[PDB]
Amino acid sequence: SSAGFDRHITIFSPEGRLYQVEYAFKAINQGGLTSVAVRGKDCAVIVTQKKVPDKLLDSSTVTHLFKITENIGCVMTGMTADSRSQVQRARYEAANWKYKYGYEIPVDMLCKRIADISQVYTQNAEMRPLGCCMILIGIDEEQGPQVYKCDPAGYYCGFKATAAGVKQTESTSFLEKKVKKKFDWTFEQTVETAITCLSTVLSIDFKPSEIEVGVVTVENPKFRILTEAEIDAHLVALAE
Amino acid sequence: ERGYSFSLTTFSPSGKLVQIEYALAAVAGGAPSVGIKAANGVVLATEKKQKSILYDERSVHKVEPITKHIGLVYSGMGPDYRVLVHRARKLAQQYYLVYQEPIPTAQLVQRVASVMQEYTQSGGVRPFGVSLLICGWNEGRPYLFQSDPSGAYFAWKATAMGKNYVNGKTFLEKRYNEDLELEDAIHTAILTLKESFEGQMTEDNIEVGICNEAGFRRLTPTEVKDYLAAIA
Amino acid sequence: SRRYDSRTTIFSPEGRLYQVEYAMEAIGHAGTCLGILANDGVLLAAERRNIHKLLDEVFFSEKIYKLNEDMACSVAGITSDANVLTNELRLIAQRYLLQYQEPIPCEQLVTALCDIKQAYTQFGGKRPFGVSLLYIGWDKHYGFQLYQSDPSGNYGGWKATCIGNNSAAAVSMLKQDYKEGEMTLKSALALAIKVLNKTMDVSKLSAEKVEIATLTRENGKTVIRVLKQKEVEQLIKKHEEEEAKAEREK
Amino acid sequence: NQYDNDVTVWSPQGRIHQIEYAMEAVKQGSATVGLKSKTHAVLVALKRAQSELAAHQKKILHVDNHIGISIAGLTADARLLCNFMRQECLDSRFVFDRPLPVSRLVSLIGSKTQIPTQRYGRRPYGVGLLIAGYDDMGPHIFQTCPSANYFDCRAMSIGARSQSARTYLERHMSEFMECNLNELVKHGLRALRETLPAEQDLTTKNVSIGIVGKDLEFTIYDDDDVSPFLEGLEERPQ
Amino acid sequence: SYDRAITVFSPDGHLFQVEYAQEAVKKGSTAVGVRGRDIVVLGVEKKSVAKLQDERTVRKICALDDNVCMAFAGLTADARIVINRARVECQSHRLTVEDPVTVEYITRYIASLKQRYTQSNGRRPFGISALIVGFDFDGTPRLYQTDPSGTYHAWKANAIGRGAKSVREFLEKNYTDEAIETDDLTIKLVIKALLEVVQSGGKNIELAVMRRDQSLKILNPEEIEKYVAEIEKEKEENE
Amino acid sequence: TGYDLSASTFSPDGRVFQVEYAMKAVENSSTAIGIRCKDGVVFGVEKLVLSKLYEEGSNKRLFNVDRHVGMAVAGLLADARSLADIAREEASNFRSNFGYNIPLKHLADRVAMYVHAYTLYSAVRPFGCSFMLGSYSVNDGAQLYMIDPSGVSYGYWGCAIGKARQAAKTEIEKLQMKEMTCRDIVKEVAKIIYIVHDEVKDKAFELELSWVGELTNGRHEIVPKDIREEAEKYAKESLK
Amino acid sequence: SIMSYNGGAVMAMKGKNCVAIAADRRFGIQAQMVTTDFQKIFPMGDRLYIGLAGLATDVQTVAQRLKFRLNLYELKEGRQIKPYTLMSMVANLLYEKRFGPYYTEPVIAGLDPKTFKPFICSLDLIGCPMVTDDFVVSGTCAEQMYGMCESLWEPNMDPDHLFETISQAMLNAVDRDAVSGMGVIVHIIEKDKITTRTLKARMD
Amino acid sequence: YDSNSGGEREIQRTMLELLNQLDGFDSRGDVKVIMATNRIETLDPALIRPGRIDRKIEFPLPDEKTKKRIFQIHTSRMTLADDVTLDDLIMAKDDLSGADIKAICTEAGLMALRERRMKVTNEDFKKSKENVLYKKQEGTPEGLYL
Amino acid sequence: YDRGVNTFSPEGRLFQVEYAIEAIKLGSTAIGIQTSEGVCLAVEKRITSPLMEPSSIEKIVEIDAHIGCAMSGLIADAKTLIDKARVETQNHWFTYNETMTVESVTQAVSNLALQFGEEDSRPFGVALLFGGVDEKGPQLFHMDPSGTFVQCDARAIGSASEGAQSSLQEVYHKSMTLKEAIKSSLIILKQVMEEKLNATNIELATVQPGQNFHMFTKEELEEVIKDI
Q: What are the residues whose beta carbons fall under 8 Å from the beta carbon of F161, sequence distance 6 or more?
A: F26, F29, F31, F32, F33, F74, F130, F132
Q: What is the Cα–Cα distance from D2 to D5, expressed in whole angstroms?
A: 6
Say which DSSP state F171 is in.
T
Which residue of H lies nearest to C157 if distances are taken between CA atoms?
H145
d(CA F190, CA F194): 6
Nearest partner of I55 among I225, I202, I224, judged by Cα: I202
Q: What is the dihedral of CA B180, B186, B188, B190, to 10 degrees?
A: 160
Helix ranges (DSSP H) in chain B: 20-27, 80-98, 105-121, 167-174, 182-193, 221-227
DSSP state of D208: E
Chain G nearest C-alpha distance from B151 (Å): 18
Helix axis angle for D75-91 and D102-112, nearest 10°, is 130
For chain A, the residues whose C-beta falls within 8 A of a C-beta of chain B are 9-18, 108, 112, 115-116, 119, 122-125, 153-162, 172, 175-176, 179
| DSSP codes of every residue in chain A | ---TTTTTS-PPPTTS--STTHHHHTTTGGG----EEEE-SSEEEEEE-----STTB-HHHH--EE-SSSS--EEEES-HHHHHHHHHHHHHHHHHHHHHH-S---SHHHHHHHHHHHHHHHH-GGG-----EEEEEEEETTTEEEEEEE-TT----B-SS---SSSHHHHHHHHHHHSTT-S---HHHHHHHHHHHHHHHT-----TTTSEEEEEESSS-S-EEPPHHHHHHHHHHH--
Instruction: Please give the helix or strand (H or E) that residue H25 lies within, else none.
Output: none
Could you tell me which residues come within 8 angstroms of residue G203 by beta carbon, excluding any fewer than 6 positions away? G181, G182
Please give the Cα distance from E39 to E103 (Å, whole number): 17
Residue pair C151/C129 in contact by the 8 Å Cβ criterion: yes
Beta bridge partners of I71: I128
Chains H and G touch (3+ CB pairs under 8 A): no
Is H133 within 8 Å of chain C by CB? no
- Rounded Cα–Cα distance for residues B29 and B19 (Å): 16
Phi then psi for residue D5, to 5 deg, are: -60, -65
E72 DSSP β-pair partners: E130
User: Which chains touch H (3+ CB pairs under 8 A)?
Assistant: C, E
Q: Residue C125 to residues B7, C3, C7, E119: CA-CA distances in angstroms? A: 7, 15, 7, 14
Q: Are C146 and C136 in contact (CB under 8 A)?
A: yes
In contact, E208 and E63? CB cutoff 8 Å: no
Rg of chain F taking only CA atoms, in angstroms: 18
d(CA G118, CA E74) in angstroms, rounded, equals 62
Enumerate the residues of chain E whose CB falls inside 8 A of the CB of residue H144: 75
Task: State the DSSP code for F237.
Answer: S
- Chain I residue with Cα closest to D16: I10
Q: Give dist(CA D115, CA D105) in Å, integer.
A: 17
Contact: E11, I23; criterion CB under 8 Å: no
D156/H97 Cα distance (integer angstroms) = 77
Rg of chain E over Cα atoms, rounded to whole angstroms, equals: 19
CA distance A236 to B15: 70
C-alpha–C-alpha distance, residues H86 and H70, integer Å: 11
CA distance E111 to E91: 17
Return d(Cα B103, Cα F190) in angstroms, integer.
Answer: 81
Distances (CA, A) of D72 to D61, D131, D148, D158, I212: 12, 12, 15, 8, 39
CA dihedral angle for residue C138, residue C139, residue C140, residue C141, rounded to 10 degrees: -110
Query: Would you call F212 helix, strand, or coil by DSSP?
Result: strand
Inter-chain residue contact C97 with G75, CB threshold 8 Å: no
Task: Name the amino acid, one letter, at D160.
Answer: A
CB atoms within 10 A of CB A1: 6
Q: Is A20 close to F9, i.e. CB distance below 8 A? A: yes
Angle at which helices I161-171 and I178-192 cross, to 10°? 150
**Do A85 and F157 count as a contact with CB atoms less than 8 A apart?**
no
D150 phi/psi in degrees, rounded to 5: -110, 135
Main-chain dihedrals φ then ψ at residue I93, nearest 5 degrees:
-80, -10
Residues G95 and G102: their CA atoms lie apart, in Å, by 10
Helix, strand, or coil (residue E198): coil
State phi, psi for D142 to the nearest 5 degrees.
-105, 180
Rounded CA-CA distance E102/E94 in Å is: 10
Q: In chain F, which residues have their Cβ closer than 8 Å to the Cβ of D8?
A: 7, 122-125
The Cα-based distances of A164 to A172, A210, B53, D78 in angstroms read: 8, 21, 14, 58
Phi-psi region of A74 (alpha: psi -120 to 50; beta: other; left: phi over 0): beta
With vertex at residue D10, the alpha carbon angle to CA D5 and CA D15, rounded to the nearest 5 degrees, is 90
**Residues F221 and F145 sit within 8 Å (Cβ to Cβ):** no
Euclidean distance between CA atoms A72 and E173, whole angstroms: 96
CA proximity to C31, closest of C132, C127, C172: C132
As a whole number of angstroms, the distance between CA G120 and CA G111 comes to 8
Q: Could you tell me the CA-to-CA distances from C122 to C12, C131, F167, H127 in Å, in that order?
A: 13, 16, 63, 49
Distance from C-alpha of G13 to C-alpha of G23, rounded to nearest angstrom: 11
Phi/psi at B144 (nearest 5 deg)? -125, 115
- Do residues G37 and G25 make contact, with C-beta atoms less than 8 angstroms apart? yes
How distant, in Å, are the alpha carbons of G63, H20, H23, H27, H51 from that of H33?
86, 15, 12, 11, 9
How would DSSP label each residue in C194-231?
A: HIIIIISSS-TT-STTEEEEEE---TTT--EEE--STT
Angle value at C-alpha B201, between B196 and B205, nearest 5 degrees: 90
Cα distances (angstroms) measured from residue A5 to each of A8, B19, C2, C214, F6: 6, 11, 20, 49, 12
Domain housing F178: 1-240
What single-letter amino acid sits at E19? E
| Number of CB pairs, chain D paired with chain I, less than 8 A apart | 69
The structural domains of chain B, with segments of one domain joined by +, span 1-232
How many beta-carbon contacts under 8 Å exist across E and I?
A: 76
Alpha-helix residue ranges (DSSP H) falling in chain H: 10-21, 45-48, 64-77, 87-91, 100-112, 122-134
How many CB atoms lie under 10 A from the CB of residue A127? 16
Buried/exposed code over C85-94 (b: 16+ C-beta within 10 A; e: otherwise): bbbbbbebbb
Kind of pairing between the strands at E68-72 and E130-135:
antiparallel
Q: Helix, strand or coil for residue C146?
A: strand
Spatial contact of A4 and A13, defined as CB atoms under 8 Å apart = no
| Omega prior to B8 cis, within 30 of 0 | yes
- DSSP secondary structure of chain I: ----TTS--SS---SHHHHHHHHHHSSPPEEEEE-SS-EEEEEE----STTS-TTTS-SEEEEETTEEEEE-S-SHHHHHHHHHHHHHHHHHHHHSSSPPPHHHHHHHHHHSSS--SS---PPP---EEEEEEETTEEEEEEE-TT--EEE-SEEE-SSTHHHHHHHHHHH--SSS-HHHHHHHHHHHHHHH--S---TTTEEEEEE-SSS-S-S--TT-HHHHHHT-
Angstrom distance (rounded) from CA B162 to CA F234: 75
Spatial separation of the C-alpha atoms in residues E210 and E35, rounded to whole Å: 9
Please tell me the distance from the alpha carbon of residue E2 to that of residue B44, in angstroms, as a whole number.
60
Q: What is the CATH number of domain B1-232?
A: 3.60.20.10
Asked whether the beta carbons of residue G75 and residue C68 sit closer than 8 angstroms, the reply is: yes
Q: Name the residue among D112, D238, D107 with its Cα closest to residue F84.
A: D107
Is C234 exposed, middle or buried, given 0-12, 13-18 or 19+ CB atoms closer than 10 A? exposed
Strand arrangement, sheet containing A36-39: A36-39, A43-48, A212-217, A224-225
- F136 contacts F214 by C-beta, under 8 angstroms: yes
Pairing state of beta strands E141-146 and E130-135?
antiparallel
Of residues G36, G1, G15, G14, the one with CA closest to residue G174 = G36
**Among D45, D195, D64, residue whose Cα is nearest residue D130:** D45
Other beta carbons less than 10 A from residue C122's beta carbon: 21
Distance CA I124, CA E13 (A): 11
Q: Which of B8, B37, B117 sits opposite C127 (nearest CB)?
A: B8
Q: How far apart are the C-alpha atoms of B210 and E83, rounded to whole Å?
A: 58
Alpha carbon distance A132, A79 (integer Å): 6
Residue among A29, A61, A82 whose CB faces F155 most closely: A61
Contact between H85 and H91 under an 8 Å Cβ cutoff? The reply is: no
CA distance H43 to H33: 14
d(CA F153, CA A61): 8
CA proximity to B19, closest of B35, B4, B34: B4
Q: How far is Cα B42 from Cα B109, in angstroms, rounded to an integer?
A: 15
What pairs with residue G189 in β-bridges? G19, G194
* The CA-based dihedral angle spanning residues D220, D221, D224, D226, taken in that order and rounded to the nearest 10 degrees: 180
Residue in chain H lying closest to C151 (CA): H144
Best A11, A110, A156, A176 member to test B by mutation, with max B CBs in 10 Å, is A11
Cβ atoms of C118 and C126 closer than 8 Å: no
Contact C98 G75 (CB under 8 A): no
Burial bucket for residue F93 (CB in 10 Å: 0-12, 13-18, 19+): exposed
Q: Report which of F190, F172, F173 is spatially closest to residue F231, judged by C-alpha positions.
A: F190
Kind and range of the H or E run holding D54: none
Q: What is the DSSP letter of D96?
A: I
| Alpha-carbon separation of residue D56 from D69, D203, D222, I23 (angstroms) | 18, 11, 10, 25
User: For residue F100, what is the domain's CATH number?
Assistant: 3.60.20.10
Q: Angle formed by the axes of helices D102-112 and F77-97, to 10°?
A: 100
Quick check: bond before I215 cis, omega within 30?
yes
Pairing between β-strand B145-146 and β-strand B130-134 as defined by DSSP bridges: antiparallel
Give alpha helix (H) positions in chain D.
17-27, 75-91, 102-112, 163-175, 181-195, 227-230
d(C-alpha A110, C-alpha C218), whole Å: 61
Instruction: Please report, for residues A88, E198, G95, H94, the alpha-carbon distance to residue H101 in angstroms, rounded to integers and kept in the order given.
Output: 83, 21, 78, 11
Between CA C167 and CA C24 the distance in angstroms is 13
Contact E192, E200 (CB under 8 A): no
H49 CB-contact burial (10 Å; exposed 0-12 / middle 13-18 / buried 19+): exposed
Our CA-based measurement puts residue I7 at a distance from the nearest CA of chain D, in whole angstroms, of 6
**CA distances to E83, E94, E141, F194 from E98, in Å:** 20, 5, 20, 86
Residue B19 CA to residue B13 CA, distance in Å, equals 12
Q: How does DSSP classify residue C167?
A: G
Determine, for residues C154 and H145 on separate chains, whether the beta-carbon distance falls below 8 Å: yes
Cis peptide before D202 (omega within 30 of 0): yes
Domain count, chain F: 1
Q: Is residue F44 a contact partner of residue F32, using CB atoms and an 8 Å limit?
A: yes
Q: Which residues of chain E neighbour C147 with C-beta distances below 8 Å?
A: 57
Distances (CA, A) of C192 to B132, C195, I70: 38, 5, 69
Distance CA D102, CA D34 (A): 15
Nearest by Cα to D184 from D150, D222, D154, D220: D154
- Domains in chain G (CATH in brackets) are 1-204 (3.60.20.10)
Query: Longest C-alpha distance within chain E, in Å?
Result: 63
Quote the CA–CA distance of D128 and E36 in Å, as a whole number: 62
Please give the helix or strand (H or E) that residue C19 lies within, else none. helix C18-27
For residue I86, which of I103, I112, I68 has the smallest C-alpha distance?
Answer: I68
How far is the C-alpha of F197 from the C-alpha of F167, rounded, in Å?
10
Q: What interhelical angle do F104-120 and A80-101 show, nearest 10?
A: 110
